[PDB]
Each structure stands twice: as C-alpha cells, then as structure tokens.
Design a protein around this ligand. Structure first.
Ligand SMILES: Nc1ncnc2c1ncn2[C@@H]1O[C@H](COP(=O)(O)O)[C@@H](O)[C@H]1O
Length: 125
C-alpha cells in the first residue's frame, strides 16, 4: 500500500543538470518545495537531490555556482517495501526523501518523511 503515500513520477518536480542554470533557477522559483530531485535529461537518470535554500542562498550570494556541486545523495527503495520497512528506512538513514522503483528498476515515484509522518499521525493506518 506504499503506492498511496507516494508522489507519482508524473507529479515530481525536478532539476535537470543538462539544462542551463537559469532554467533550473526558474523551476525552483516557481515551486514551494524545499528539496528537488536532480536528474540528467529525464527522471529515469536520477543523480540525487538539491536543497532549494542552498541553491538560492548560493545564487543570491553571487558565487561561482555549478549545479552538480550541490547535489546530495539519494536513496532508492523497491516498491515491495512494507509500510514499517519504509518507516525504518527513513529513521535509519535520516533521509527527507526516498525514490521508489518497480521490479524493472524503473522509477515509480518518491516518498517524503513529511508524508510518512502525516500518514502516521492522521487516520491513514
Ligand atoms: N520536488 C518535489 N516534487 C513533487 N512533490 C514534492 C517535492 N517536494 C515535496 N513534495 C511534496 O510536497 C510535500 C511538502 O514538501 P515541501 O513542499 O518541501 O514542504 C511533501 O511531503 C511531498 O508530498
């Protein structure tokens, strides 16, 4: 049932290392999200994740900025994980965001800690 807590791949807002820095800046400016998955060309070539605050901080800073330098590591998990197993993966890793793949290794979506906590403290379970 981990699919229902998922942000589907079509709803993922992401940055593209193959695009100009300015286009990614605009993507970030037009979204409320704190963190963005970063890929190359498309979401099936995910390279990691970027903090918006950092990107913008270091942009407003005016320092020589290359997007690839702010990328942080991203964890993948199978879509076959149970709710508990997913929860424990979050606690163990301390990750805010994890990527979910199907049996072909293809990206199905992402899960956030935030969404995981909302589901625990609401009426989900
Ligand atoms: N980069 C993103 N793309 C799509 N949805 C996201 C992204 N970041 C966060 N979300 C969703 O928005 C919620 C709030 O995240 P935030 O907007 O960063 O406070 C998360 O729990 C996810 O449901």
């Amino acid at each position: 049932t981990i699919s229902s807590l998922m942000v589907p791949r079509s709803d993922i807002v992401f940055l593209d290392l193959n695009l100009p820095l300015d286009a990614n800046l605009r993507t970030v400016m037009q979204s409320p999200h704190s963190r963005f998955p970063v890929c190359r060309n498309n979401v099936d070539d995910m390279v990691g994740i970027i903090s918006a605050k950092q990107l913008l901080s270091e942009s407003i800073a005016g320092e020589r900025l290359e997007l690839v330098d702010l990328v942080k590591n991203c964890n993948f998990v199978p879509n076959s994980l149970s709710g508990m197993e997913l929860l424990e993966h979050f606690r163990t890793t301390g990750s805010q965001m994890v990527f979910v793949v199907d049996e072909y290794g293809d990206l199905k979506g992402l899960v956030t800690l935030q969404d995981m906590m909302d589901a625990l403290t609401g009426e989900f379970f």
